[PDB]
């Protein structure tokens, strides 16, 4: 439906800001984690303040109005978090709020309730304690995923929003840990290469060769609800492609992926990334809600609160076993092989709501 098709849009065009913050570099988010974040601080907004957020979420209210976008989240945060046979997964996101703000009650059951979030009344006069009390909600949350998401925190800060996913899940089809290269060349610039492993088996993967957009696009499945795509760019297409990415482009691809018998070869990597998100969500429309003249009054009674900081990190495995800890000891040349060998664009999705779980590009999947 339409709100998978209004969050893809946002994922791409939050992509773009981060490409011109930082050019030429790894990124990595949830964009629904991302998105639901700001709804749900929206629900605790009144009048501007709470408008803004849902515009620059990429809603019109003319369109639709703000009830129905808050009951359109109520059932994507619902359906994701719902415990599936083979699958771990879990969006969430809290508060924490100075002490001497006393968050209503209200507030405080709808956002547990209705969108999985935690609200915590922290002292923030003393910003190392507070970091080690968020960090470890996070750490608690990721298991162990997720470590020390807030390095910076200024002694101003009076509230601050933390988004976050737990992701596990195995490969539709595990590869073969012995079938692995130790050493395998990889591009990064057309004047630089570096050594990532590269895990080798060859299966039936959905594929396609973009001839409007100059990219090979392939489909690796988990085995339950979850899928990453690889899109790897012909050379110096990068940026276009970066360009083309909307939801237009995936319903496109949807339609043409075909199924085949295909020497696959995909690096061993981690990536992680972690965002102070203010700058970019500023730029891109959500004003008030930093600003002097927040309006919060469905969130508190008492005056002074706003929007200090808003922090995310995205940490994602790709391994032979699926998302998890490797630590795994030691034919023919007619197939058609797909070799992700270059820097190249990634994304998880959920198949059930549409959702893009993980976005990102790789530029050097060595850290
Ligand atoms: N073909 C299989 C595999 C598949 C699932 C998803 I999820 C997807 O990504 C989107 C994202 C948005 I936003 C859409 O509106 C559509 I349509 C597809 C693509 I590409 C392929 C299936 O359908 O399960």
Redesign the pocket.
Known sequence: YKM??I??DFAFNLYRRFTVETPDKNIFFSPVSISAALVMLSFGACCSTQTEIVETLGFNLTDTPMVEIQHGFQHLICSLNFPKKELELQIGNALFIGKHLKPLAKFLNDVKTLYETEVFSTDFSNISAAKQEINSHVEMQTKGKVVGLIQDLKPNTIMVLVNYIHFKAQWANPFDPSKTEDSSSFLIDKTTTVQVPMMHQMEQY?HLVDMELNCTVL?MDYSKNA?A?FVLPKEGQMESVEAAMS?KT??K???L?QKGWVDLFVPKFSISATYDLGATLLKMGIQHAYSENADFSGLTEDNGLKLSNAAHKAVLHIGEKGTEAAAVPENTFLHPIIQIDRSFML?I???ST???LFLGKVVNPTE
């Open positions: 998978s098709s969050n893809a959905y489909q899928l795509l939801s995936l319903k691809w949807n339609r992926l994304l999705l959920e198949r549409r959702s893009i």
